[PDB]
Amino acid sequence: CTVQVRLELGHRAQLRKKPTTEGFTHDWMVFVRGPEQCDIQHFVEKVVFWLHDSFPKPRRVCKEPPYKVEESGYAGFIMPIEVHFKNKEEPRKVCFTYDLFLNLEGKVNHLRCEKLTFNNPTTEFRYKLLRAGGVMV
């Protein structure tokens, strides 16, 4: 028994008409979502976004959708992202290192698809997966 499920990581970034008081030139938003008509909440406990030091409260947690962070700033950066599962056995989470890159001349619309694979899920975990659009192989 093996179920595969699809995650979408992505971000949008726009240059601001006029900057902020601190000289923040960009507004951006980073997210974890399922593909069209898949609610990943059925198996995702929470998403952890590890923001850069310069941010107040760098460890940003979303326990329910939308799994997202919206901030402003002047520069892009590398960002660890952790997706925790509603799962009482290993693996209980997965990590990606996300590059939030900015366009200094305009907008950025970026999407990135990751396919998780669960070998021999339990009876209760296996729907959480199938409820969320999972597929058996």
Side-chain angles (χ1 to χ4, degrees):
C1 193
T2 302
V3 194
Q4 291 184 314
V5 74
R6 283 149 59 224
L7 276 193
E8 268 178 25
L9 279 44
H11 78 289
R12 277 184 298 280
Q14 42 272 334
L15 196 44
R16 320 175 31 121
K17 66 312 189 186
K18 316 230 165 200
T20 64
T21 45
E22 312 80 338
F24 292 157
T25 48
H26 281 82
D27 289 326
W28 51 259
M29 178 222 54
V30 65
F31 59 87
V32 179
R33 74 161 101 111
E36 228 80 69
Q37 299 268 38
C38 296
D39 300 343
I40 62 174
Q41 176 174 14
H42 280 295
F43 72 99
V44 170
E45 173 212 336
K46 66 175 172 233
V47 181
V48 173
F49 304 85
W50 292 92
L51 300 189
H52 195 274
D53 293 90
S54 36
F55 283 98
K57 326 149 295 194
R59 188 188 117 103
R60 308 283 181 94
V61 191
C62 295
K63 286 192 133 250
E64 53 246 14
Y67 304 104
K68 89 202 275 156
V69 175
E70 298 194 274
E71 290 294 340
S72 321
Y74 53 97
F77 59 98
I78 291 299
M79 170 181 144
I81 299 189
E82 310 188 290
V83 184
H84 297 249
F85 308 132
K86 292 172 161 161
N87 189 14
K88 313 161 142 51
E89 297 202 85
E90 282 304 319
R92 304 248 308 143
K93 77 185 188 186
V94 61
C95 300
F96 319 98
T97 86
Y98 196 81
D99 182 20
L100 205 158
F101 50 90
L102 307 181
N103 178 1
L104 312 174
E105 288 292 356
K107 311 184 182 305
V108 153
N109 193 346
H110 189 79
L111 206 54
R112 171 182 144 180
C113 325
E114 297 286 342
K115 186 115 202 164
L116 316 168
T117 292
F118 288 96
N119 310 266
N120 299 296
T122 74
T123 281
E124 188 39 79
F125 194 51
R126 193 189 64 177
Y127 186 82
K128 290 167 178 302
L129 296 168
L130 296 172
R131 208 315 181 184
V135 174
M136 310 207 32
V137 313

